[PDB]
Amino acid sequence: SSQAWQPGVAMPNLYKMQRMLLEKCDLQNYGDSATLPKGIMMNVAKYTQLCQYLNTLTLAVPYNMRVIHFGAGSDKGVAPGTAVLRQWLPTGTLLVDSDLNDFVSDADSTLIGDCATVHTANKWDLIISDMYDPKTKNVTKENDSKEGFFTYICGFIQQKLALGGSVAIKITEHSWNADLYKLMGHFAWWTAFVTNVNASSSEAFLIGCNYLGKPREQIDGYVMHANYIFWRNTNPIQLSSYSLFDMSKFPLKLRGTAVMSLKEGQINDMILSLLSKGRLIIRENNRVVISSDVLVNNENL
């Protein structure tokens, strides 16, 4: 009932526990659009609701936080989602974004190129991805796990997400990857969150809350995506913009979460318990250095 006053709807735990088979996604409210406040873009609204939901979880929020945002450019040449993330994150948070095509951004640094060309020396506290190829919405072909940028994202998380860190990765009916769902089991908690403003779409953000660096739970990703679609197919979400009108508690609280460098082998059950509670980040606190690989070619004669 009250779901219309929330920023969106997270997949209830019982649907996560099913063993459904994958079906086509048929949303009753398909094609409907929410009424956005005057002059507000869908992507501003969408990221605001995502951030409002993230405010309800046990995110670690250290001093000198590091956040990276893939898929940040729009067809308009600007980065609406980055602008919302920077509003949401504490002032001074280091924010890097990236996209295939050129765009103008408020991030501290921007890398233009395929995500597979992005390398970073440091680990990150939060990874956001809006990466999406609309050519995947081919309803006439079978819906298999996709590779492409999802393969990169899975490796990036395992190699460069700090222990205690969190992610939010955009998926849809056809844009999904089984190993990414499997990796959700390496977090203390996970969900698939649907924004109320975009509830007529099969889009969701797959959210991993507090990374543990090892499986807490064995998740079959083909089954979990079928479970996700089953949920969407059987649970119409009323489009709603209601939460956009109350921003008083929007900013992410600067928790000053502790950061420690530790070697694998110092990670005991007390450490894992603190990681699982949003009370600790494990990574080095060096300087943040990034780069984009550039392919060189000379096309002459």
């Binding site: 406040p37 002059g39 507000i40 873009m41 501003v44 609204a45 605001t48 729009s74 308009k76 040449g77 600007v78 980065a79 609406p80 980055t82 602008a83 919302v84 920077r86 509003q87 002032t91 050129d102 103008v104 951004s105 408020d106 991030a107 501290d108 956009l244 921003m247 008083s248 929007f250 900013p251």
Partner: protein, 116 residues
Amino acid sequence: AFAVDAAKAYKDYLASGGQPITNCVKMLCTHTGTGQAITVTPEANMDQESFGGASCCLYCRCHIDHPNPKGFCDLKGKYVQIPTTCANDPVGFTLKNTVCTVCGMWKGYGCSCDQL
């Protein structure tokens, strides 16, 4: 001795009846903020809209060098408050107007330092 003058070109285009630059990124906020011109987080008051700064910067949006001899952008990475009556052209507004160095309000749209 030649440099492109983008400011003047946009001012002349506007006067010629041209459509203001679009897709400036408008933020959701309380509209109970300080009303200062350029801030690290949205600060629109009741008579303003807040926008992501890069999207309101002529030089950022046109992919040209900033006039600063060092190339630094006043707006990028910040939020700009624009009077609601002028929010159809934030880029025009930020170009044409000036921030009071004392109180941080826009000259003539919040700055009262020059009053008795």
